[model samples]
Target: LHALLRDIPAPDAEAMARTQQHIDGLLKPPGSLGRLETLAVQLAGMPGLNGTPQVGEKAVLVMCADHGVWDEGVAVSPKIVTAIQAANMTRGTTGVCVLAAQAGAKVHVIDVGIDAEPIPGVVNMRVARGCGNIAVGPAMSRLQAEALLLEVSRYTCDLAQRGVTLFGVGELGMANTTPAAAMVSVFTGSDAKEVVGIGANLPPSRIDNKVDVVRRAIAINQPNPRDGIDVLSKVGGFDLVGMTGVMLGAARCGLPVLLDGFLSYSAALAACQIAPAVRPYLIPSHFSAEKGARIALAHLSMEPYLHMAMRLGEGSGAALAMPIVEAACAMFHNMGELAASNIVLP
Candidate 1:
């Protein structure tokens, strides 16, 4: 962990300046491209061996797990849905997989702690059967939390070495929103009701139940907001911890990470708290309908690129947004400058 921290170099300010200069020289009014120009500059600034932006080889890492809070009637779906969705992801039948294929990105599923029988193709990295019920106590031990973090970091670094230049972080876990809201509340000091949403389309009564559960979980665990590990261990699901690892590891490897939705954003929040250096490497994909998503993004000071009302949590938002990032990269490299185009500007 210390080595990872020590190795996380700062973003290349020189590269950013060069990128901005190149963008300004393009045959267009200054800042006309808006966020796309900013996106290109951000990508160019990512610390890499070539000191250039690369988004051709992209993959979405979807972390799967089951939450013990499911036992509290927090989700309309059965706990088995987690395992089923994990299998479906490998089969490319789920929304995220299909969207990823369309976006020219591969989808890789990791089973961090699903409860049922192991799915055939999902990578088995189970740290526990499932996280402990946060409403009752800490979700996992501090050791387990650190282990999850290290596993994700190592996996991300391995992918980077394999030539994967861009990554999207996502999650799949039943009743996961309860804990997500809990963590957001802890970090942002917001009321549970303000952050909690009707996850999985649960009715208002169940939403109230979920809010109460989040409240009770925080009250019971008393997770310290200052210590990310403490907050994660107390209320974080395995998928959440793994997503946090993906952010930390990607930043350390000098790769950009596309954050999915609320759940992924919650993890990003904790990751930023753990290592503020990771903030520059993150890109918010979309504004999820989840109430906490706005709060989480606001906390990060990140404005998402898309607002498609997407709430499906299997990296779907990230997949849909990948092409836009790719387009920005394309423009950065291929767009003709005023001299080359012979287009006189007033």
Candidate 2:
């Protein structure tokens, strides 16, 4: 994985410029297509090559785990739900699976750290039974955390080699919102109370407790803002670490990664901290209902593609928004220039 990171080429600024020129030459007015135009340019530049971008053969990698922080009553769902949903996802029964099917994308459900017996069909890559509770101590040893990330990186690279050009990252972990919020606070310097939301629709009265749990976790861990590994080891979960690896690996492999909701965004932030070049490879799929979603996007300087009040963490938003990305690529590659269309530019 380290060698892969070392082998990552710099962004192709020249290709980005060429893509922008092509967009301008399209029949529509320049900049009229808004974010899609910019998105196409980004895709063109991601491979660090001077040509049109390729965004075919997409896959959403749902990394499932159980967070020890669930013991603090930070979420409404039980830890068992993580494994259950992970199993359901492999069977194409979960929200992400359904939406991915509609988008003509494949879904790969991976067990990174579920706290239960492995179910058939789900890829078993358990880094640990589950992450250690962050409220009382570090989530996992630094070495373990690094290994988990490296494992994810290798897995993503394997998928890329199998012809998956675009990747979306999702997570299925009970009480993951707590660590996600803590990670956002640590990286964005936001207070826990501000970023914490009604994850899984916990009771209104329990919101304060969730906030306190995040605060205590961060206070106990005191993760360094500048060091992503330290922050992840102190407050991150296995699912988050795996997702971070997806982002980093996608960047190294010259593929674009669609980030889903708050948890994935937090992972994207961690990836950016680990390697600033990874930022260009990240694409925000939607603005999750979670409060931290906006903050995380802003910190990464990204604009989301959708805002349908989505709070589901199974990559539903990413799946739903992928068709739009495909359309953008289609337009870039299929649309004719003004001259070809016999239309003169004003």
Best by lDDT: 1
Candidate 1's C-alpha runs over 4 A off are 342-346
Candidate 1: residue pairs that collide: none
Candidate 2 on 115-155: residue-level lDDT in tens?
99888998888988899999999999989888888888988
Q: CA shift at 258, candidate 1, in angstroms?
A: 0.2
In model 1, where is the ten-residue run with the lowest total lDDT?
Answer: 47-56
Q: Which ranges of candidate 2 are over 4 A from the true structure?
A: 48-50
Q: Model 2, poorest ten-residue lDDT window?
A: 47-56
- Which candidate has the highest TM-score of all? 1
RMSD value for candidate 1: 1.1
Per-model TM against the reference: 0.98, 0.97
**Candidate 1 structure quality by residue, lDDT tens digits, 17-121:** 999999988989889999999998898889863565558588999999988899999999988899998998988999999999999899999999999877888
**Cα lDDT listed for each candidate:** 0.90, 0.87
Model 2 deviation from native, Cα RMSD in Å? 1.4
